[PDB]
Amino acid sequence: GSHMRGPDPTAASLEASAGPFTVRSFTVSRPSGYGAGTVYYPTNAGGTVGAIAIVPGYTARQSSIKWWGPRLASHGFVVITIDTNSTLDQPESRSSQQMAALEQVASLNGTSSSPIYGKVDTARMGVMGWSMGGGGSLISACNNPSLKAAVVQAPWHSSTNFSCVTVPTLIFCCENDSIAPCNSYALPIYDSMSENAKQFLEICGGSHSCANTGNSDQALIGKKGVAWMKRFMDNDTRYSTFACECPNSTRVCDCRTANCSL
Ligand SMILES: [K+]
Ligand SMILES: [K+]
């Protein structure tokens, strides 16, 4: 109800490159507890919106995950994409930096001269990431169960026991991933979670970078990531089917769901 933004969704509206809202962005001038940041925001969402912090993979920078920023922002979210202090930071450090990025978004929401002054509902936050940034996002969810949603891609962690996660979590993995293979990372992670709404979606033919900037499946991946965040960060039941369904797309090679009603 009170958190619903924008028009009733359709498959076509969610598959398109952009949602209904106009997006601006800026570079964070003095990043506090992480390497660098870009904030993407809707100028005209018609109310406060939730915030999402996105962390790249091992060896990687904002470039790898930046497509998410405009894609989510255009549907009604403030999105911070980060660089980590070092490209070689591990999951534990990525989680800390991720939460520091959300904390800085909260500072900017309270700063009259900021472009996102008063645009964020600080009680509604989400976490995303690729690779070790995905591992880090699930760590964030374990330590901060009031986070509304997690959406991760080809997650990597040195352990797969995420039974601690009570946050609604969508896991993308990439069929042909040799670095964080579905069978030893994403799927055991998925299976460990007993306490939440969850979905597992394998993208056909995909390398480890199959959900990164420039990927050929942004219609499907974007639709799913946006629908998940809309259903869970906004309690927007107009998105329940888009969030919880298994798409019959020939680009989907596996789909598993629990505790997710259509
Ligand atoms: K932009
Ligand atoms: K600043």
From Swiss-Prot:
The keyword rRNA-binding does not apply. Optimum pH is 9 for PET film hydrolysis. Optimum pH is 9 for PET (commercial drinking bottle) hydrolysis. Optimum pH is 6.5-8.0 for BHET hydrolysis. Optimum pH is 8.0 for the hydrolysis of pNP-esters. The enzyme is active at pH 6-10, has an optimal pH range of 7-9 and it is rapidly inactivated below pH 7.0 or above pH 9.0. Has potential for application in environmental remediation and biological recycling of PET and PEF waste products. Its main location: secreted. The keyword Glycoprotein does not apply. Pfam families: PETase. Coiled coil: none annotated. Disulfide bonds join C174-C210, C244-C260. Changing W130H: Displays increased enzymatic activity on PET bottle and on BHET. Exhibits improved PET and PEF degradation capacity relative to wild-type PETase. Salts and glycerol enhance the enzymatic activity in vitro towards pNP-esters, while detergents and organic solvents reduce the enzymatic activity. Pathway: Xenobiotic degradation. Optimum temperature is 40 degrees Celsius for PET film hydrolysis. Optimum temperature is 30 degrees Celsius for PET (commercial drinking bottle) hydrolysis and BHET hydrolysis. Optimum temperature is 35-45 degrees Celsius for the hydrolysis of pNP-esters. Remains active even at 65 degrees Celsius (about 60% of maximum activity). It is an enzyme of class 3 (hydrolase). Gene3D superfamilies: alpha/beta hydrolase (3.40.50.1820). One of its GO terms (cellular component) is extracellular region. Its EC number is 3.1.1.101. It comes from the Bacteria. The active site is at S131, D177, H208. Changing W130F: Increases activity towards 1-naphthyl butyrate. Changing S131A: Loss of enzymatic activity on PET bottle and on BHET. One of its GO terms (molecular function) is acetylesterase activity. Involved in the degradation and assimilation of the plastic poly(ethylene terephthalate) (PET), which allows I.sakaiensis to use PET as its major energy and carbon source for growth. Likely acts synergistically with MHETase to depolymerize PET. Catalyzes the hydrolysis of PET to produce mono(2-hydroxyethyl) terephthalate (MHET) as the major product. Also depolymerizes another semiaromatic polyester, poly(ethylene-2,5-furandicarboxylate) (PEF), which is an emerging, bioderived PET replacement with improved gas barrier properties. PETase retains the ancestral alpha/beta-hydrolase fold but exhibits a more open active-site cleft than homologous cutinases. PANTHER family: DIENELACTONE HYDROLASE DOMAIN-CONTAINING PROTEIN-RELATED, POLYKETIDE TRANSFERASE AF380. This is Poly(ethylene terephthalate) hydrolase.
